[model samples]
Target chain A: APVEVTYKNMRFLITHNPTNATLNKFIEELKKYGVTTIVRVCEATYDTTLVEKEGIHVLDWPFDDGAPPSNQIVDDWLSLVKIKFREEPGCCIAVHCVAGLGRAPVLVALALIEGGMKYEDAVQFIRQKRRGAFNSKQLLYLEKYRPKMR
Target chain B: MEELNIIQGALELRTKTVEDVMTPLRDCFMITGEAILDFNTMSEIMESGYTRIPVFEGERSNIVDLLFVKDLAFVDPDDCTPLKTITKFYNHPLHFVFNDTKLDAMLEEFKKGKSHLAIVQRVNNEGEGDPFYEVLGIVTLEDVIEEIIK
Candidate 1:
């Protein structure tokens, strides 16, 4: 199942790894809401049978919750996501992980922070929407994270 | 390790798993809870030339902590210095990885923690309720470097 969270009228849907049912439901809901793209972060490779839809991209980098993605990868992903958001203004951008908690939230928090939100405020906001959005190490990582210097 | 060798080694490391580079459990030198951390034990540990040693509670599979040899610098090597007291010097938490974990992924984890050691857990297929997992071996920072070069 997925939950929708928004800041400034731009909606972001966050959810766990999808089964066929959940994935189909997500697709229907997003299309209904006019979503433009989906960003998936998971170690597992895509199953075309389940995720063959257009408008979805997979960025496969797997690490434990305690060990967040490297600073460079995090920065690069944030940059790409920001561009995607700008390219299709107001179109929904959905993010998901295996459990909808660890990796997904870290990326969302980073995106929020890069988009002018304070670090503390971003974390508090995400957690308020999706309980346990970040683990302890992820929280610490987000606190100290900064986009890599150009 | 030469420049060319380092480059070749990095590629090789990415193709392998932790099990390919890890020291088998039987080959790993370990200390148990029953033992006292006396001057003799300290001398033996130093002589073993391992940067980290596993401290087990009841069995080798039940590692409670990883003792970093550098932590010894903080301890006064007196005859009566109990081994358990040295546990305080064991600053790094015991990290575990599946035997099939990719070496590149394992290296990422090593970079995140000050500890150089991670216990390798084997996949358990016995039943729904087997001992949480079986300890397969141990992987260290040196093992990773050796994988790249050798």
Candidate 2:
């Protein structure tokens, strides 16, 4: 099961890649939570058509584990998030990378930092809500990383 | 409507991967970034009729960027520019995806973006040693569209 965390009035679901059978369940559960956008960071495995078929907008930002995405990639992900946020301000954005640990948390933390929270605060906040939210390198990357000014 | 037909056709792509339709590496025409771009090389590239070609670093697996044939319109046909020089200034950003990426999702991405070619990579496994990345083939927007419409 995925954990839900709150950041600046928005809810983010942190979880692992869903199985084909579970993808339906996942969408049903997200619908219960009123999730409008789904951001997937893992490599494709299941039938993603189920995502849009369920009416949730999906963004696949795939990258390998242990291979943190480049700065440009991070910016690109953030841009997508910004656009979604702007389009549907009331809808929550659900995010997940392999295990909802490394890549997921980094993108969420960056958004938080961009929205005005301190880097340390962002890291601690996500960890509090979802334990083991990120690896040491991911943490360091967030500590030193800076998102482009909007 | 055509839109509904496209959506229905796109569903068929979910079961296919870039590997199922890509031009395999052995058959792909590519150029090294470090090589000199002499007139003969340029002429052959033009003869190949490929609009885009991958530019690699030392090995085929280490692709750096893509060279657009249209960009050459501004270059003098007789001027011998190093491939690296051309790439440094004119190389277009490339989109990389795992060979296993679903054509349905890949087509969705292509529809929303500028990149037309995606370099497909696969994991290299050799018994016990840590796996490395290997360029398996290349997929184009046409490839996915053709798959979907067929």
Docking class of 1: incorrect
lDDT of 1 at B73: 79
Instruction: Compute the lDDT of residue B32 as modeled in candidate 1.
Output: 82
- Using all chains and alpha carbons, the TM-scores for the candidates as numbered come to 0.46, 0.47
**Top candidate by TM-score:** 2
Q: Report lDDT (Cα) of residue A35, candidate 2.
A: 78
In the range A1-150, model 1's lDDT, one tens digit per residue, is 466766663567776565554567666776765666666666563453444455555455555543577766776776766676678777776666664466777776777776678889998898676544566667778888774421
Worst 10 residues of 1 chain A by lDDT: A45-54
DockQ of every predicted complex: 0.01, 0.01
lDDT scores in order: 0.70, 0.75
Q: Evaluate residue A133 in candidate 1 and report its C-alpha lDDT on the 0 to 100 scale.
A: 57
- Give the alpha carbon lDDT tens digit for every residue of B5-69 in model 2: 77777777878898898988777788888767677888888998988888888877667788888
| Model 1: CA > 4 A from native | A1-150, B1-5, B74-79, B128-131
CA error at residue A117 for candidate 1, angstroms? 33
Give each model's clash number: 1, 0
